[PDB]
Amino acid sequence: NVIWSQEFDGESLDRNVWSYDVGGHGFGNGQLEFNTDRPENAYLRDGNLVIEARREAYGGNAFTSARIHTRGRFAFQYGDLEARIKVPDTSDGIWPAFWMLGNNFPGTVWPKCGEADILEIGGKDGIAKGLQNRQINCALHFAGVGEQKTSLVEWFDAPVDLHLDYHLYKISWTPTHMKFFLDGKEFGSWDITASEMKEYHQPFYPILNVAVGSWTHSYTGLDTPEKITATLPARMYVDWIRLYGHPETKLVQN
Numbered sequence: 631n632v633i634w635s636q637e638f639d640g641e642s643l644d645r646n647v648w649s650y651d652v653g654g655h656g657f658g659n660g661q662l663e664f665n666t667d668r669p670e671n672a673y674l675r676d677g678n679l680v681i682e683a684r685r686e687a688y689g690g691n692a693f694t695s696a697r698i699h700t701r702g703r704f705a706f707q708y709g710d711l712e713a714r715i716k717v718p719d720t721s722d723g724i725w726p727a728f729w730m731l732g733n734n735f736p737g738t739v740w741p742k743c744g745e746a747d748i749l750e751i752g753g754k755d756g757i758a759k760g761l762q763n764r765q766i767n768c769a770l771h772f773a774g775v776g777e778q779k780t781s782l783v784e785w786f787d788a789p790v791d792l793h794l795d796y797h798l799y800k801i802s803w804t805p806t807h808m809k810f811f812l813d814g815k816e817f818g819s820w821d822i823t824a825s826e827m828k829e830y831h832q833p834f835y836p837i838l839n840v841a842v843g844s845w846t847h848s849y850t851g852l853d854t855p856e857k858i859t860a861t862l863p864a865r866m867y868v869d870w871i872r873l874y875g876h877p878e879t880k881l882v883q884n
């Protein structure tokens with residue numbers, strides 16, 4: 631029961647749904663890319679959203695990409711949100727993500743707003759073990775007991791090379807759980823009923839981005855332009871994002 635979707639069929643990204651996060655300040659992870667609002671980094675073509683990371687001097691950084699979200703235009707609480715994505719070869723450097731934030735961000739500060747990562751790929755462990763094209767994770771980031779940052783992470787070694795084709799990346803979100811799926815199969819699950827997880831019973835909005843690098847202590851382990859070996863340009867193809875409604879779903883389209 632699709633009740634909301636972006637099919638990415640047009641010639642340009644719909645600014646009446648999408649907003650750009652612009653900057654090269656590192657986004658609290660020591661990221662190297664400058665996320666721009668230009669057509670070179672986010673464009674539509676052949677029924678796809680393309681987010682393109684490039685090795686390119688821009689704004690004082692050595693890479694450009696894009697980070698887009700629907701805050702203010704689309705949010706929901708409970709439902710199945712799924713995206714058909716072909717990720718780029720991450721081959722040491724590239725850090726794509728499909729994730730969500732609570733709809734009270736940024737007024738409510740992170741992570742009290744709550745966060746759910748549906749797909750992340752390109753981690754340091756994946757690099758260390760030669761599983762760059764296979765190892766993924768989902769995650770919950772929130773204010774736990776005593777209102778302090780808590781992180782729950784579930785890793786999964788995918789069976790096939792994910793950058794070779796489109797796959798379906800989904801969250802199933804109910805009043806009791808958040809579950810995460812690859813091609814219909816569950817690889818993560820958490821109960822969200824506990825007193826410290828009330829942040830996960832409000833509307834959330836989706837985010838899509840392709841980051842380049844991080845601090846060494848952060849996701850990729852690769853903190854300088856010279857340590858980025860990945861094939862650039864790197865393109866993430868999104869065929870669509872669809873919300874399958876539940877009885878309890880609330881839609882926010884203001």
Ligand SMILES: [Ca+2]
Pocket residue numbers: 637638639677678868869870
């Ligand atoms: Ca499409």
Ligand SMILES: [Ca+2]
Pocket residue numbers: 772773774775777825826827828829
């Ligand atoms: Ca909490």
